[PDB]
Amino acid sequence: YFQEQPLRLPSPEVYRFVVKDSEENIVFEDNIPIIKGGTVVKLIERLTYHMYADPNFVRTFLTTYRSFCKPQELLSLLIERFEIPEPEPTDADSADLKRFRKEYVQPVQLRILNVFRHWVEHHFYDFERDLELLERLESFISSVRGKAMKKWVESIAKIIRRKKQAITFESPPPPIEWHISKPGQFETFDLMTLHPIEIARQLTLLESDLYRKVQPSELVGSVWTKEDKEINSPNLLKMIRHTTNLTLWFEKCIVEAENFEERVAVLSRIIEILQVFQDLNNFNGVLEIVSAVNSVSVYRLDHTFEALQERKRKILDEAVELSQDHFKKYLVKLKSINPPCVPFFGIYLTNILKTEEGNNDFLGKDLINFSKRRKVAEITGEIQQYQNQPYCLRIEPDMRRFFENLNPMGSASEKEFTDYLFNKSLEIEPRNCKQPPRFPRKSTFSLKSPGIRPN
């Protein structure tokens, strides 16, 4: 309701962050204002604005900035923003200078240190991937002089020390289940020799830990599909590669069982493991098995599926329904169950890949489209903010290592391995055969399942 005297600022030629706002360097949305886009200089200016604090923009920026700015560039810009020159003395030469220091220099310099604090607290992986970046930040933070900023400086270093350093159960976990293979002899571990309960438990723990380690920045900008995927998305790729190898493992176990009765038992055991996956709300494991039975080499084995117990076939059909109609039943099932759970990552990745292709990276000079990043950060934010629980199950390390190091493809490549599985599928059940041919049983152990009831 009143316009006060404007602050006397340095020239834009000496401090490029005070260049005047224009639709050619920054754009806002008509919905604290909401930034639609701009130059990275204008984005940094609003990231450390002097008039107000903007924690939502800080959180969103530090999650998404790798899609439009490198971590080294971000640090340089923040340091450049910190080193604010004072305006050249008036043509007559202190009232404007005292005002400039209290209302502009101190607020901006404190906003930058808050950005540093959020950066090292919530995204220290940047400094683990780039040690030169961390030594630049420590060198700059040491050179920071001022008693008002000492609390901030020692707070940043306190967090860095914590990050440079780096189970227990609420209720007693149930005992580990063993079938034919016994503790220690990892060389004999296999789908049918291990216990179906414990296969599902150990893969559920493994897939829960893999899922928990994925951070939003590994998804922003689809960086897991681009040139630097191994560096920017190491946890997400481990999640994708585990799911690929486990899906191929279930397919291999079925098709390589040439004896018909052995193959029906193998498929039956897999449906039992699926049964425990559903008990544990492990939807990743459920859809791993559905993907395997939907492979062309397994799906065509009509004699195998028709020999199943009707109860086990209805369990499998129930799980196949989860994915039908664009995962309609899966979405309402996930919303209804309670944690601990392991949601399916695939639907999230397609959501993000679809908005990445729809929205443009840029909005005179081409300006970074930050609204696109805010939309992508809102998808990942819904994943991060789900209140999930750790599983109350004990880890068996040898089984864990067995599932970690599963390599079903052997020496063959992707297309060669699918050719091998489809040719083997045609051998064990030929096209238009009246009954499956008889093959010798390769297992020297019984295929009777111990069930999925514990104790």
Ligand X SMILES: NCCNc1ccc(C(F)(F)F)cc1[N+](=O)[O-]
**Binding residues for ligand X, per CB under 6 A?**
211-212, 214-216, 219, 236, 239, 345, 348-349, 380, 383-384
Q: Which of 256, 290, 253 is nearest to 274 (CA)?
A: 290
Task: Return the number of the residue (180 or 240) whose C-beta is nearest ligand X.
Answer: 240
| Least separation in angstroms between CB 61 and ligand X | 16
Alpha-carbon distance of 281 to 372, in angstroms, equals: 32
Task: Return the number of the residue (387 or 413) whose C-beta is nearest ligand X.
Answer: 387
Task: Return the number of the residue (75 or 210) whose C-beta is nearest ligand X.
Answer: 210
| Least separation in angstroms between CB 221 and ligand X | 12
Per the CB < 8 A criterion, the answer to whether 57 and 35 are in contact is yes
| Least separation in angstroms between CB 157 and ligand X | 26
Alpha-carbon distance of 29 to 326, in angstroms, equals: 33
| Least separation in angstroms between CB 121 and ligand X | 15
Task: Return the number of the residue (176 or 353) whose C-beta is nearest ligand X.
Answer: 353
| Least separation in angstroms between CB 245 and ligand X | 16
Q: Which of 78, 90, 149, 87 is nearest to 116 (CA)?
A: 78
Task: Return the number of the residue (90 or 384) whose C-beta is nearest ligand X.
Answer: 384
Task: Return the number of the residue (87 or 346) whose C-beta is nearest ligand X.
Answer: 346
DSSP label at 339? S
> Order of strands, edge to edge, in the sheet holding 368-369?
26-28, 35-38, 368-369
Breaks in the chain (C–N > 2.5 Å) following residue: 31, 93, 166, 363
Within 8 A by CB and 6+ apart from 322, the residues are 283, 286, 287, 290, 329, 330, 333
| Least separation in angstroms between CB 219 and ligand X | 5
Q: Which of 315, 309, 332, 297 is nearest to 421 (CA)?
A: 297
| Least separation in angstroms between CB 312 and ligand X | 29
Alpha-carbon distance of 159 to 161, in angstroms, equals: 5
Task: Return the number of the residue (29 or 128) whose C-beta is nearest ligand X.
Answer: 128
Residue nearest to ligand X (CB): 345
Q: Which of 66, 174, 71 is nearest to 130 (CA)?
A: 71
